[PDB]
Amino acid sequence: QRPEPTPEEWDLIHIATEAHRSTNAQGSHWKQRRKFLPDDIGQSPIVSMPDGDKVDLEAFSEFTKIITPAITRVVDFAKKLPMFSELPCEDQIILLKGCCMEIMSLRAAVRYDPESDTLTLSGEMAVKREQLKNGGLGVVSDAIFELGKSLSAFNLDDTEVALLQAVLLMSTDRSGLLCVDKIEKSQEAYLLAFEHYVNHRKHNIPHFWPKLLMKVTDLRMIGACHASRFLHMKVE
Ligand SMILES: N[C@@H](Cc1cc(I)c(Oc2ccc(O)c(I)c2)c(I)c1)C(=O)O
């Protein structure tokens, strides 16, 4: 009834799923290696910042210590998608700076653990809503957790997530792009493959596809609130 990946789109999906899996911290068995950020950390948000806000700085350090590798992995992922590597250097850097939080956020959210109400950062650090609120995301902490809980139910697989990530990456909605039309063709290709792959999985949920497109908007929201700290160093 509802259409299902063409053979060129099965190819796209292999490449994208392998790019995601090869850059997802600790891989598919991440859950068996975790350290819970300890209780005494992230509880006291007392230090002002050059931006005006108060932050439990110890916590902010513990987070800042593991963020660069996480960024690196987003870049590794991007560079493994051929439609992304064909872009000019100038546009690659824009696009990366632009989705890097959208993607790290999604990457944590699908590793939401209802058993302990924690997010899992880079496959190892289990954190509570309040630790990451006080560590420097404000309300953004609350937004990712709501999303975590929301996705438990959708039960996404590494392909769905991979493809979701490519749709985030090839956004045409960024200041400064040269090759806008190429990016939109590629976004459209990924969207259409993704819609098809979702067909191919009979999801025991009504309206799965459109419900899931809505979480794109939530992720672009996250990325818009926490966009400052990405004048990151992209090396192509
Ligand atoms: N867990 C993801 C990676 C990931 C890593 C970290 I550190 C995260 O927290 C942030 C991000 C920006 C900030 O300014 C602060 I303060 C904390 C998140 I949300 C995600 C993965 O699987 O790659």
Numbering used by the authors: 156 to 391
Provide the authors' original text about this structure.
Accordingly, to model the human TRα mutants, we crystallized an artificial mutant receptor (P393GX) which was truncated at the carboxy terminus of helix 11. Importantly, the P393GX TRα shows similar molecular behavior to the human TRα mutants. Small crystals of P393GX in complex with T3 were obtained which diffracted to 3.0 Å. The structure contains one P393GX molecule (amino acids 156 to 393) and one T3 molecule in the asymmetric unit. However, despite having the potential to form a complete helix 11 (aa 363 to 393), in the P393GX mutant TRα this helix terminates at Ala 379, with the peptide backbone turning at this point to form an extended coil which runs antiparallel to the adjacent helix 5 toward the corepressor-binding site. The T3 ligand could be placed unambiguously in the hydrophobic cavity of P393GX TRα LBD and binds very similarly to its occupancy of wild-type receptor LBD. However, T3 interactions with Met 388 and Phe 401 are lost and the orientation of His 381 is altered. Arg 384 makes a new interaction with the ligand in the P393GX LBD, donating a hydrogen bond to the 4′ hydroxyl of the outer ring of T3. Interestingly, the lack of the carboxy-terminal end of helix 11 and the joining of the loop to helix 12 creates space for residues amino-terminal to helix 3 to form a short anti-parallel β-sheet, which is not present in the wild-type receptor. Remarkably, given that so much of the receptor carboxy terminus is missing, the ligand binding cavity in P393GX mutant TRα is almost completely enclosed due to the rearrangement of the carboxy-terminal portion of helix 11.
Unliganded TRs recruit a multiprotein complex which contains corepressor (CoR; e.g., nuclear receptor corepressor [NCoR] or silencing mediator of retinoic acid and thyroid hormone receptor [SMRT]) and histone deacetylase (HDAC) to inhibit target gene transcription. Receptor occupancy by a ligand (T3) promotes the dissociation of this corepressor complex with the relief of transcriptional repression and mediates the recruitment of a protein complex containing coactivators (e.g., NCoA-1/SRC-1, NCoA-2/GRIP-1, and NCoA-3/ACTR) with chromatin-remodeling activity, inducing the transcription of target genes.
